[PDB]
Amino acid sequence: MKKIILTIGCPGSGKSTWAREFIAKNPGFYNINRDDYRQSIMAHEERDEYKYTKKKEGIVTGMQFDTAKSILYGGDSVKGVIISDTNLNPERRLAWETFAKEYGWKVEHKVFDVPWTELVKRNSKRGTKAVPIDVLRSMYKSMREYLGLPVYNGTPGKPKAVIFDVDGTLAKMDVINPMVVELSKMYALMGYQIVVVSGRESGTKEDPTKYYRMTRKWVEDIAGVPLVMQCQREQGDTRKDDVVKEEIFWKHIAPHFDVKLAIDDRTQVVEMWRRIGVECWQVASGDF
Amino acid sequence: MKKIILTIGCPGSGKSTWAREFIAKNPGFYNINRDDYRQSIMAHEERDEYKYTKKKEGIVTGMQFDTAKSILYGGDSVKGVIISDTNLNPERRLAWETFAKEYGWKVEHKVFDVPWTELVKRNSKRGTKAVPIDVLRSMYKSMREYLGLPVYNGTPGKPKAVIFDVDGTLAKMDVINPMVVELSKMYALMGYQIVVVSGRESGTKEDPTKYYRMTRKWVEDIAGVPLVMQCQREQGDTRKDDVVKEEIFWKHIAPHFDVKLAIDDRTQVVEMWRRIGVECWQVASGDF
Amino acid sequence: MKKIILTIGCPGSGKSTWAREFIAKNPGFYNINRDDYRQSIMAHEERDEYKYTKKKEGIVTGMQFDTAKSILYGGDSVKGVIISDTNLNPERRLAWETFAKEYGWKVEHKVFDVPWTELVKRNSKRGTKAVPIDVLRSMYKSMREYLGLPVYNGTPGKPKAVIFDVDGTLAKMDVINPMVVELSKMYALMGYQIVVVSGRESGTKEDPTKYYRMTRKWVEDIAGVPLVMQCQREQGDTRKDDVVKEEIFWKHIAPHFDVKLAIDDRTQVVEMWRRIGVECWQVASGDF
Amino acid sequence: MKKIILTIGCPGSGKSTWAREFIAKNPGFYNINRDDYRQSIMAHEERDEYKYTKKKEGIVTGMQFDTAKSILYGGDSVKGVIISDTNLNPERRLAWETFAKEYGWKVEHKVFDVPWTELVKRNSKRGTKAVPIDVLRSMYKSMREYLGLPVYNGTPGKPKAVIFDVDGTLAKMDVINPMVVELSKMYALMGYQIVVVSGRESGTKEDPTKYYRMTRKWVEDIAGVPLVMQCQREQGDTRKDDVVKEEIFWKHIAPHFDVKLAIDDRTQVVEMWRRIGVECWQVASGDF
Ligand SMILES: Nc1ncnc2c1ncn2[C@@H]1O[C@H](COP(=O)(O)OP(=O)(O)O)[C@@H](O)[C@H]1O
Ligand SMILES: Nc1ncnc2c1ncn2[C@@H]1O[C@H](COP(=O)(O)OP(=O)(O)O)[C@@H](O)[C@H]1O
Ligand SMILES: Nc1ncnc2c1ncn2[C@@H]1O[C@H](COP(=O)(O)OP(=O)(O)O)[C@@H](O)[C@H]1O
Ligand SMILES: Nc1ncnc2c1ncn2[C@@H]1O[C@H](COP(=O)(O)OP(=O)(O)O)[C@@H](O)[C@H]1O
Ligand SMILES: [Ca+2]
Ligand SMILES: [Ca+2]
Numbered sequence A, B, C, D: 001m002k003k004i005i006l007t008i009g010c011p012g013s014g015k016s017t018w019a020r021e022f023i024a025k026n027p028g029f030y031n032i033n034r035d036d037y038r039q040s041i042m043a044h045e046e047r048d049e050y051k052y053t054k055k056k057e058g059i060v061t062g063m064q065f066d067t068a069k070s071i072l073y074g075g076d077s078v079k080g081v082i083i084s085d086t087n088l089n090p091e092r093r094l095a096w097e098t099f100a101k102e103y104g105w106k107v108e109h110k111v112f113d114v115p116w117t118e119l120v121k122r123n124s125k126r127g128t129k130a131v132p133i134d135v136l137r138s139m140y141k142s143m144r145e146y147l148g149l150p151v152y153n154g155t156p157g158k159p160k161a162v163i164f165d166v167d168g169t170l171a172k173m174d175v176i177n178p179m180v181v182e183l184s185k186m187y188a189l190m191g192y193q194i195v196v197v198s199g200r201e202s203g204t205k206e207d208p209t210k211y212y213r214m215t216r217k218w219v220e221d222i223a224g225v226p227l228v229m230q231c232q233r234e235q236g237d238t239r240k241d242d243v244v245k246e247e248i249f250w251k252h253i254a255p256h257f258d259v260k261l262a263i264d265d266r267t268q269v270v271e272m273w274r275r276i277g278v279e280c281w282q283v284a285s286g287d288f
């Protein structure tokens, strides 16, 4: 059965680079792409900004439809086609299936799950092919939905709480950040539990809690934060703050507290927070 | 007297485009640039990421120095040279002056003040020449210092206050944003004055306060914000929220309140806030 | 009646640049191009060399066909489509007509006649989109056929002759070029008439035959060429040798001699010769 | 002793690509290039055509001089510099040596000998960095001089002769090419020896002279060429006509005849001919 391969990925995820190699190595496969049909009908040059329109979309969609049938209905030489779009819209994916079922073709996916941080990196250097940051956030939000990743929706019965980070949030570089520290105390009065988190490694190979202890002491004897729990990146862990903090949240926090907010300063972490369903306020420029 | 023209501008401000035209129109002028000397000593290709180093910088600085003397010491045909770097570091600018004073040359500046918003726009499409967002923020911070633009440092004797925006901050799209509304009341108890601001146009040409009135009512009868002042973009004003809110701050707020914080959601406005010396917490994704 | 506009031109003739502007200025027009469909089905990157194939061509042709019907069968908003290919193959052009006649559309052409010399120039700088020189010669040969330009096929009854140029051919820079001079005499014995031509301007504004006289004398008293006719670019004429020599051929030579060969050294002139039906031998490197 | 590495090569030979890798792998090495200094002083954009000038050259030369001293006079960290220009001008190369001798540095060369055919290929796709074809011919002529390759200057005492190729020259595709065949006979009368050469493989693995015999017969019984010698690419040889014919010339022709001319049609072969000192007339378009 001739196959139709939908590439599932955010812009900048490796889609096209892979399609080009696959076609180079496997005779009988052809690429179909909407970005290409979008630039061609306007005869746009590499650096022109395409103006979105329902009309133009219907046309490109039509072009994909017709180009698929025509190629798949080619001789026995034809093995399949690659639809190298983002394919991040469920409705769009279903259509390819129904369309494939009536003519007798099968559908396969080829996923390109790339970490948010890397996607941002690439897109900022993508130049003219760059995509706005918010449509990127949205694309990734859809990718997570495709993978079936978790979205927090609260913890019924458990005490409400606010999450505070240390570096850049409660501490500056350490001295206290007056308004944020005053906030944690403000929330405490209001009856909320104060959970503290930090991406600082706990300690060294020989003293595995050196930094943790220092952090705890600082929070207690300088900031005076009435916290109930403190969590930190374990010693030895070299993964991204991104991954580290989320792992800590599902394993040590979500099951014990009804978190209604998170206070942080580092964009990637802030991005992780909103992304998983936790309101987050960014208290300072944290593009690093 | 032969002149040395320093272009003052952030990356993406028009520096090079102007230098190329000026040289094309004025015989006897030559360009000197560090980005160029930086890529050349490494024989880098358009898409390689340059690795910063003191050594490599000393070399490029040396190259600028020597290339300046050699060209300016050319015949009578030579009129001057353009130093098309950002030139946003005061120390760096002084050096060119002292250097120019000993050989008998004069220094002129050619400023390229472009709005933050536009600088971001261009840099995100700059592709490989793109610069990290934080070094851009920093460059612009220096540009503002060069222009002598105002930086807020408080208001002694006046009552402390927090600034809250409406769209996206207190209101969602309208329904209340629970945590942020709860915050304004929380600060009020703490003794702070609550100043409300909005980029929403006050009204229409025929009803110049239509939206203002609606906003006031909403803040009063739905959010229940104990505000003391509300300010909004005047009817007819079509400038950027960027400019609008800052104008409102210096004219109607800074002189009446000791503002210690601002709550907003739109990145450009948040960026304006921190930029002028006002702590600001971004309560939601606002890349628009 | 909705129109289909075929752009007639060699690669590098301005086709696409015009299509982009036309579409920008005229709402309801869309571009259709085979180069675009060719790079897309292979998911090729700007710098990949496309491998020609009947299969791949049938597919792109199919894509043009289907994309035309689908767009032209759009609402009343649709005004037409531009087929921005070279369209230099008569058979190909007919197809568009027959195809247009059955669905009720009309066909218009938009010619981009650019001089060979300029086409070469652009193509050598076209980089990756560059086309081999021989396919370019061929494209231009078809363009000339489209315009109905003249192709020489002899002159019955008139005496046979060979055409010799002076600069670079008979003369070097002047001293004689031994073999070529020996040739003209060799042909004379064989019974051929020797016609001499030169792109050298005849003279100056005040002495309109200064150079002609000098050339005649040189050919007579140094080379010893038994010529019957000498023709030169008139004084004041600043057009390309290209145009100049061909004008001279049809007006002063073709009607008086049965030319069976031309001896020249400058590539553009040599190219003109073969192009119009006259065998030509290039006696030296003349890329200038 | 700190070294100065001059890269010797024609444009498009791999110079820069190598310099970038070498510097990437060897800490303490820096690149110096005139193309880079040429585009920088004019602040030119990738696609601008640089206007040559003595003034601008003196400046770039000065920049190379000063940049060399300054870097080589750096700490002990500095190992050397790469001068990635063509370096094909002997005078220019000497200067680097004398310059290197007074400051105590040594000079090394890194040759990039690439075949003419490949150099043309690359340059035609080089786009904006492309170089005119004649300056390329000239560069390669200098490269050959650097390598010490042979240039023919005649054969005293031996009988004069003309060299004729078969495919495209004497034969068309075979039928006779009337004027060229008539020429060989014309030269024979004049007392010249007619040497025939062909790039056609002599035969097959099982019949190693199949094609040679066919060619000989054709030349004898159809063209009627009064030849004295016929030479052909041996059976099995898969090298370029380029190399094949030159090998045949020095081994089987130059020592037996005083060749004063060569008649061919294929550009690369014609290019080889003039290049080694043999007048050559190109009788037809042979860009293949
Ligand atoms: N492994 C990688 N590391 C860094 N960048 C990559 C990698 N793979 C691809 N890229 C780059 O990411 C960008 C997106 O490429 P692509 O695969 O074509 O996806 P899309 O379909 O969104 O264009 C391109 O600029 C490409 O060169
Ligand atoms: N008026 C403009 N509008 C939009 N973009 C511009 C404008 N002028 C220049 N640019 C672009 O901004 C970028 C920065 O250009 P440039 O003047 O060379 O500054 P820099 O010295 O930082 O490279 C380039 O991509 C350029 O083409
Ligand atoms: N007036 C002009 N002068 C010089 N070059 C031009 C001119 N107009 C277009 N070009 C260039 O010629 C090349 C061919 O352009 P284009 O119109 O797109 O034709 P094609 O359909 O063959 O690609 C491009 O590199 C383009 O920028
Ligand atoms: N092995 C190769 N095969 C084909 N092209 C190459 C190869 N190596 C380099 N090139 C290309 O040849 C051109 C000349 O490259 P470069 O080494 O930089 O020489 P130059 O100093 O003249 O610029 C470039 O476009 C480059 O990418
Ligand atoms: Ca991630
Ligand atoms: Ca932090």
Ligand SMILES: [Ca+2]
Pocket (backbone or CB within 6 Å): B114, B115, B116, B117, B242
């Ligand atoms: Ca601004």
Ligand SMILES: [Ca+2]
Pocket (backbone or CB within 6 Å): B165, B166, B167, B168, B169, B264, B265, B266
């Ligand atoms: Ca807002």
Ligand SMILES: [Ca+2]
Pocket (backbone or CB within 6 Å): C114, C115, C116, C117, C242
């Ligand atoms: Ca012409």
Ligand SMILES: [Ca+2]
Pocket (backbone or CB within 6 Å): C165, C166, C167, C168, C169, C264, C265, C266
């Ligand atoms: Ca000539």
Ligand SMILES: [Ca+2]
Pocket (backbone or CB within 6 Å): D114, D115, D116, D117, D242
């Ligand atoms: Ca060679």
Ligand SMILES: [Ca+2]
Pocket (backbone or CB within 6 Å): D165, D166, D167, D168, D169, D264, D265, D266
């Ligand atoms: Ca041949």
